[PDB]
């Protein structure tokens, strides 16, 4: 399962951001198909619930090579829900920058295991249980607000 995680990180800037991929160290555009050659770490999409999206090929068959080969990409295409898959996705590109294609309210943010990694300036955020109705169906997930 975890073999579908893109691992192409490169700490050229000597910042040490790959540490957050392992442990919670003190940190202190339309959705299209992206190549796994640039992605570093898990790719999360928010439906609004947080979901990980693994590496696939150009057709959609699952690949388990950690995003090594140039053929491995990420299937990031969805309409706006309920009919669509997700509203957007976030991930870290291989040199340590956060990319987007989680913000419910300008004050809150959908919490997920790597929320502090993608958004470092969200540490001093209390947690709130949020019920959200997207087309009649409810979603009980945790959000990180002020």
């Amino acid at each position: 399962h975890i073999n579908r995680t893109a691992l192409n990180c490169n700490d050229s800037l000597q910042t040490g951001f790959i540490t957050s991929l392992f442990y919670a160290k003190n940190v202190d555009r339309p959705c299209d198909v992206v190549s796994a050659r640039t992605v570093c770490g898990p790719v999360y999409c928010f439906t609004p619930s947080p979901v990980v999206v693994g590496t696939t090929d150009k057709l959609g068959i699952p690949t388990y090579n950690w995003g090594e080969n140039e053929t491995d990409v990420f299937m990031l295409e969805s309409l706006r829900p309920p009919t669509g898959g997700w509203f957007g996705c976030t991930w870290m590109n291989s040199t340590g920058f956060t990319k987007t294609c989680p913000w419910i309210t300008p004050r809150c943010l959908v919490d997920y295991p790597y929320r502090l990694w993608h958004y470092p300036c969200t540490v001093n955020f209390t947690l709130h249980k949020v019920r959200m109705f997207v087309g009649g169906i409810e979603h009980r997930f945790d959000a990180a607000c002020n």
């Epitope: 439906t47 990980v52 696939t56 959609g60 309409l79 309920p82 009919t83 898959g85 087309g135």
Partner: antibody, heavy 119, light 111 residues
């Protein structure tokens, strides 16, 4: 094109599992919806699953007693329908919707599986 | 509030006469990014349905040109020009611009 489980007779109260196997033997970028049709009734949409990511979206009518599972390496999606009753006797189809979402319909349809509930 | 109604429920047309099926809704199917998601289906006897139109005006592959779709918003129309003996069974209209995806009542076409 898509294979499907055979017909079954389940007594009221039990559960039923219906398999759906694409002809490729592998999963691809598409949503695999489940549609049923009661005798003399219009087509009813039950749930949606993306076998690549594992997202499930059930209808409010069947919420709480339906379970659409997936098993990769086997390329067979399942539909656990518990708490059966008389009106659940119908033909069940698995349909291939686009990966981007629904709306655009279903390209491929299963052969159909007639589940009969009777004592 | 959203209900799909097909009319007429039974459409008899002799072989070679143009036909039309109307499928009116109560809410606009324009959705967010446009592209009204209305789809027409055809279910034979003993066979599962099969899509012929996937976006009102767009025709699916493997479908004869004798099929066409029109309408916008609430009113919709599936019009057939040259009816053959092949076009038999029930015709459906599904919607995918409002959760959950629902199908039309059905229109049984006989010659």
């Amino acid at each position: 094109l898509l294979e499907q489980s055979g017909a079954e007779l389940k007594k009221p109260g039990s559960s039923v599992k219906v398999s759906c196997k694409p002809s490729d033997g592998t999963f691809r970028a598409y949503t695999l919806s489940w549609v049923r049709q009661a005798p003399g009734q219009t087509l009813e949409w039950m749930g949606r699953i993306m076998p690549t990511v594992g997202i499930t979206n059930y209808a409010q009518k069947f919420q709480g007693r339906v379970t659409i599972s997936a098993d990769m390496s086997t390329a067979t999606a399942y539909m656990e329908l518990s708490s059966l009753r008389s009106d659940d006797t119908a033909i069940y189809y698995c349909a291939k919707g686009p990966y981007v979402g629904l709306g655009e319909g279903f390209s491929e349809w299963g052969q159909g599986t007639l589940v009969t509930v009777s004592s | 509030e959203l209900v799909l109604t097909q009319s007429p429920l039974s459409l008899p047309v002799t072989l070679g006469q143009p036909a039309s099926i109307s499928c009116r809704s109560t809410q606009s199917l324009v959705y967010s990014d446009g592209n009204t998601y209305l789809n027409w289906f055809h279910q034979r006897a003993g066979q599962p349905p099969r899509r012929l139109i996937y976006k009102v005006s767009n025709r699916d592959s493997g479908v004869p040109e004798r099929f066409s779709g029109s309408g916008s918003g609430t009113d919709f129309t599936l019009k057939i020009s040259r009816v053959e003996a092949e076009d038999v069974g029930i015709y459906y209209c599904m919607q995918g611009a409002h959760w959950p995806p629902t199908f039309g009542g059905g229109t049984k076409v006989e010659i």
